[PDB]
Amino acid sequence: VDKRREINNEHPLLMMPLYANGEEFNQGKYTFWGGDTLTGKWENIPDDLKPYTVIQLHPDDLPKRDGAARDFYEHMLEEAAKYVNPKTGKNEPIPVILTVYTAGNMPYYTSAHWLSTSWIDKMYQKYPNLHGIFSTENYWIWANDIENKAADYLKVSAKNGGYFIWAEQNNGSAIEKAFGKNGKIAFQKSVDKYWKNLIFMFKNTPAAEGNDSTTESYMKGLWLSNHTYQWGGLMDTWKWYETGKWKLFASGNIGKSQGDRQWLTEPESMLGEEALGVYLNGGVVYNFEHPAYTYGVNNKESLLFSEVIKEFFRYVIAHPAPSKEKVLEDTKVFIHGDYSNKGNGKFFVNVNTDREQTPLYMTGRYNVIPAIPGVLKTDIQIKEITSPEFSSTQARKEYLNKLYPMNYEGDIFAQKLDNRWFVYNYKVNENVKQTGKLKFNSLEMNVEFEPHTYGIFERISNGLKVNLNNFRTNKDSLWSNAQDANQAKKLPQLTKKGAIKWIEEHYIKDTQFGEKRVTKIVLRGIDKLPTIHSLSGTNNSYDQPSLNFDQKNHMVTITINSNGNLEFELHF
């Protein structure tokens, strides 16, 4: 059946979440938390991005009873279906994805429980603008018939030419079980027929359990082995709450005690560092939480959205991610087996991650090593997870080091694609500068990055194109009146409503921008003083870069002082 949309490297997808306000629904009003509206939100999306963005409805705290989610969803599907573009005056139905399964669809957790497969089929038939359905976050409540239900969602989507999109994390072997590890094989068999209509994403919310790397490995491997059409990630600023962090760089752990302050605190640019792990490995679907901080409120873009996500998403449209063909050519090792039997996220710590609790990598040398669970058949060295090479940290590196050569110097994350070096500082909550030395041919480039900074350096015919992002606003005001972790833990709760109000009042406006901070780029093998061209970036966020040319040493030091996004070319 003809696909309702394309999702691939040239046609990536940004999911745009809208969360139902259940309190207001009880009063007969149809509204979203944060005050976005379906029509206003769509209208605000830049026209260039509209072909690649889909509205994702989520039932959030709708009443947990029959009829509530169906009622709210039908209301919104009608709004989407009859939208009129005014400019054009033409009816242009808004593309929609419905959230249909979450928290195991337990009747004590979600109104989505009372959305039948029969109702889903009827919606797809009624609304050509319904492009897919979404299951999200079930690892902690792995319902008895989850795999059976997932098979039904995939089939009903394939029947109608829509996509079934599942965002899940390998906590408690979730991804392995989905494909039949524990004998529940309905979904495995569904995928054998309908993988062209499946999108599989990570969901990095449960940061305390450290399953980021293994989940992403699986996502990439399932894609490479034709067990999902495309893959991606849902990146979640609640990870800061899950790991008990508070004020940026501060000592002490406050555990899960200040939720609504905590999901605001993750550095804006760190979401781009996370998203790079998707792009660089051929993933093409992106989604974020908490929506109020990552997207915005009241139909306006937050600064995280405008300065990081929108720029990054424009980048992956203009430079499509590597194709399956290409990723597959580049893969030297493919793992077959269950990470859950080999320490789960611990498998990669001190291989390509610096700690158990991180969504980042410490080296791009192996990029992301792809895997599929042991229940799947295979169907490049394909290596069983139980083989001697994987028995320990050192063994893993020895084996991988023969097949993936060292291709840069320095304690920093860097990965190369064609003429481009992608670089970031991998520290999460420690204020440590990092440095690296990268080579194009010939041209040798050193960089020094503070934490929460990524750059893309592209060798061009007359020099170097640079895109830099270190956007990080000051969140200290949220942690005012707390001199240590003990005092922070006891602050009055910000609350969900208070945090939305803080965003309106102190983020969307009256922003406490962060201090400008220094990045250095050193070019070696240089004949003359390079010149800077096409300089642009976040408004009022950067000084004019400074150059220092040592003619005898064929080298130039470029000093940038900034806090935001930035782009320019050097000609030489």
Ligand X SMILES: CC(=O)N[C@H]1[C@@H](O[C@H]2[C@@H](O)[C@@H](CO)O[C@@H](O)[C@@H]2O[C@@H]2O[C@@H](C)[C@@H](O)[C@@H](O)[C@@H]2O)O[C@H](CO)[C@H](O)[C@@H]1O
CB 397 within 8 A of CB 363: no
137 binds ligand X per the rule CB under 6 A:
yes
CA distance 164 to 132: 6
Considering the complex, what minimum distance in angstroms separates the CB of residue 504 from ligand X?
15
Secondary structure (3-state) at 213: helix
C-beta of 201 vs 445, nearer to ligand X = 201
Percent helix, strand and coil across the chain, each rounded to 5?
A: 35, 25, 40
Residue 30 or 440: which CB sits closer to ligand X? 30
Q: Cα–Cα distance between 101 and 111 in angstroms, integer?
A: 9
Q: In this chain, which of 242, 274, 311, 354 binds ligand X, going by CB under 6 A?
A: 242
- If phi > 0 it is left, if psi is from -120 to 50 it is alpha, else beta; for residue 194 that is alpha
Question: Which listed range, 75-83, 156-164, 237-245, 347-355, lies at the site for ligand X (CB under 6 A)?
Answer: 237-245
Residue with smaller CB distance to ligand X, 103 or 443: 103
Q: Nearer to ligand X by C-beta: 137 or 338? A: 137
x/- contact string, 21-40, with ligand X (CB under 6 A)?
A: ------------x-------
Residue 203 pairs in a beta bridge with: 234
Closest approach, Cβ 112 to ligand X, in A, equals 8
Give min distance, CB of 177 to ligand X, in A. Answer: 18
- How far apart CA 423 and CA 157 sit, in angstroms, is 38
Q: Indicate which single residue of 61, 74, 79, 121 sits in contact with ligand X (rule: CB under 6 A).
A: 61
Q: Which is nearer to ligand X, 285 or 556 (CB)?
A: 285
- Per CB under 6 A, does 307 bind ligand X? no
DSSP string across 289-357: ESHHHHTEETTEE-HHIIIIIHHHHHHHHHSPPPPHHHHHHH--EEEES-GGGTTGGGGGBTTTBSSSS
> 83 or 286, CB closer to ligand X?
286
Residues 319-378 that bind ligand X (CB under 6 A): none
The nearest distance, CB 223 to ligand X, in angstroms, is: 22
Comparison of 241 and 408: residue with beta carbon closer to ligand X:
241
CA distance 51 to 95: 9
Pairing type for strands 555-562 and 381-384 reads unpaired
- The closest alpha carbon to 61, from 97, 94, 34, belongs to 34
Q: How far is the CB of 212 from ligand X (least distance, A)?
A: 14
Nearer to ligand X, 137 or 266 (CB): 137
**Pick from 132, 146, 65, 56: nearest CA to 101:** 146
- Using CB under 6 A, which of 53, 129, 136, 453 touches ligand X? 136
* Minimum distance from residue 24 beta carbon to ligand X (Å): 13
Strands in 221-295 per DSSP E = 230-236, 285-289
Closest CA to 154 of 196, 111, 201, 203: 196
Nearest approach, Cβ of 80 to ligand X (angstroms)? 20
From candidates 12, 15, 60, 376, binder to ligand X by CB under 6 A? 60
Residue 404 has φ and ψ, to the nearest 5°, of -115, 110
Q: Which long-range contacts (CB under 8 A, 24 or more apart) does 429-436 make?
A: 429/245, 429/248, 429/249, 430/249, 431/249, 434/410, 435/410, 435/411, 436/408, 436/409, 436/410, 436/411, 436/412
Pairing of strands 230-236, 285-289: parallel
**Is residue 269 a contact point for ligand X (CB under 6 A)?**
no
Query: Which residue in the set 268, 289, 311, 356 belongs to the binding site for ligand X (CB under 6 A)?
Result: 289
* Tokens encoding 269: 């640019």
Q: Which of 241, 390, 426, 507 binds ligand X (CB under 6 A)?
A: 241
Binding mask 444-483 for ligand X (x = CB under 6 A): ----------------------------------------
The residue (of 9 and 138) whose beta carbon lies closer to ligand X is 138
Q: Shortest approach of ligand X to residue 16 CB, angstroms?
A: 14
In the complex with ligand X, the residue whose CB is nearer, 137 or 458, is: 137
Residue 60 or residue 152: which is nearer to ligand X going by CB? 60
Q: Quick one: 137 or 311, whose CB is closer to ligand X? A: 137
- Taking CB under 6 A as the criterion, the residue among 496, 506, 516, 520 binding ligand X is 496
Pick out residues in 502-561 that bind ligand X (CB under 6 A). none
Q: Which residue has the tokens 């905590």?
A: 262
- The binder of ligand X chosen from 290, 365, 427, 452 (CB under 6 A): 290
Q: Which is nearer to ligand X, 103 or 491 (CB)?
A: 103
CA dist 424 and 436 (Å) reads 10
Instruction: Work out whether 211 is an interface residue with ligand X (CB under 6 A).
Output: no
3-state DSSP of 498-560: HHHHHHHHHHCCCCCCCCCEEEEEEEECCCCCCEEEEEEECCCCECCCEEEEEHHHCEEEEEE
* 205 touching ligand X, by CB under 6 A: yes
| Count of residues in the chain | 572
Binding status of residue 106 toward ligand X by CB under 6 A? no
Q: In what order do the strands lie in the sheet with 546-550?
A: 434-439, 444-449, 517-524, 555-562, 546-550
**By CB under 6 A, how many residues form the interface with ligand X?**
17
Please state the closest distance from residue 205 (CB atom) to ligand X, in A: 5
| ∠ Cα 412 415 420 (to 5°) | 120
Closer CB to ligand X, 158 or 494, in the complex: 494
How many Cβ atoms from other residues are within 10 Å of residue 553's Cβ? 10
Q: Summarize as ranges the residues that interact with ligand X (CB under 6 A).
A: 19, 33, 58, 60-61, 102-103, 136-137, 205, 238, 241-242, 289-291, 496
